[PDB]
Amino acid sequence: LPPERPLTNLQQQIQQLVSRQPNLTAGLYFFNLDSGASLNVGGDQVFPAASTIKFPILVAFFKAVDEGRVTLQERLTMRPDLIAPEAGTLQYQKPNSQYAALEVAELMITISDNTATNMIIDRLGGAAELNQQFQEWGLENTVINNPEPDMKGTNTTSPRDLATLMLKIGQGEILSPRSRDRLLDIMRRTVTNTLLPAGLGKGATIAHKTGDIGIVVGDAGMVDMPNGQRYVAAMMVKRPYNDPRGSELIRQVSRMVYQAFEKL
Ligand SMILES: *C(=O)[C@@H](NC(=O)Cc1ccccc1)[C@@H]1N[C@@H](C(=O)O)C(C)(C)S1
Structure with a gap:
């Protein structure tokens, strides 16, 4: 893998573009x-x-599946204490009904199901257990403090953390080949493609996961370009509640970076 080589020009244009937006922190x-x-x-x-x-x-x-600690087909219970509002479909089902682990994991990502997320976090041993794993993977600022939807925004990450984890997964680290490919497939079938994907050119593909709590909007993933190049991408923007300028800034930066990599 080649050495990190800043495009100093393009970085400067992006900084100029974010810093002229008052109530946005990017x-x-x-x-x-x-x-x-x-x-x-x-x-x-x-x-x-x-x-x-x-x-x-x-x-x-998927690490747990690789390690035989969790099975794709084992049944997880939607316990009352795990049921959560906001995004998701599981919340409308009978409390204490059960779902295949893989199905739950997929819903967590594709539709951002918060109940599903709580079910997975609990099954994997809780937030602390996960936080330790994140640290092991080099994710310095990625921390679960509260169950989802966590509308207050207590759960933390960084753009470098998200992009770097994706770099690793893309390069075949952490997960087995079978789990990696499953994960990327799921992450190409999310229903929210209004941020990073909106700035990509025709024929580009992207495995990613968005986040929006009104006061913060973001997206991270891996982009394959028709020219053969691949890059990882992560952007988070603090905004006034549901400010459409926040989501538009992500598009704009996505577009800027995509076009620069077309030209080079
Ligand atoms: C993750 O942040 C999720 N958001 C919520 O559960 C609360 C919420 C608040 C206002 C509008 C929409 C949702 C889900 N993931 C985000 C995302 O992936 O960007 C959605 C907008 C899909 S909801």
């Missing part, structure tokens, strides 16, 4: 796997994770 990290071209604009800063933390939790899930 952090982002991008890395090109072929050139080593990198972009870091507040990429190491800590943010409320919102639902972006569901990506690290999915990694933890």
Whole structure:
């Protein structure tokens, strides 16, 4: 893998673009796997994770499957204490009904199901257990403090953390080949493609996971371009509740970076 090589020009334009937006606080990290071209604009800063933390939790899930601690077909119970509002379909089912572990893990990601997330976190031994695993993978600022939906934003991550975990997964670390490919398939079938994917050119693919708690919006993943290049991408923006400028800034930066990598 080539050395990290900042595109100093393009970084400056992106910083100029974020810093002229008053009530927005942005952090982002991008890395090109072929050139080593990198972009870091507040990429190491800590943010409320919102639902972006569901990506690290999915990694933890498949790690457990790899290690024989969890099975894809075992039945998980939707206990009252795990039922959660906001995004998800499980919450409308009978309390104490049960679901295949894999089905639950998929819902956590595809539709950001918060009940499903709580079920997985609990099954994997709880937040502390997961936090330790995140630390082991090098995720310095990725921490579960509260169950989902965690609308207050107590759960933390960083753009570098999200992008770096994805780099690792993309390069075949952490997870087995079978679990990796399952994870990427799930992460290509999310229903929210309004952020990073909205700035990509025709024929690009992206495995990613968005997060939105109104006061914070973000997205992270891995992009394959039609030209053959691959890069990882993560951006988080603090905003006034549901400010459409926050989501638009992510598009804009996504577009800027995609086009720069087309030209080079
Ligand atoms: C993760 O942050 C999730 N958000 C919620 O559960 C609360 C919420 C609040 C206001 C609007 C929508 C949701 C789910 N994941 C985000 C995301 O993936 O960006 C959704 C908008 C899909 S809800």
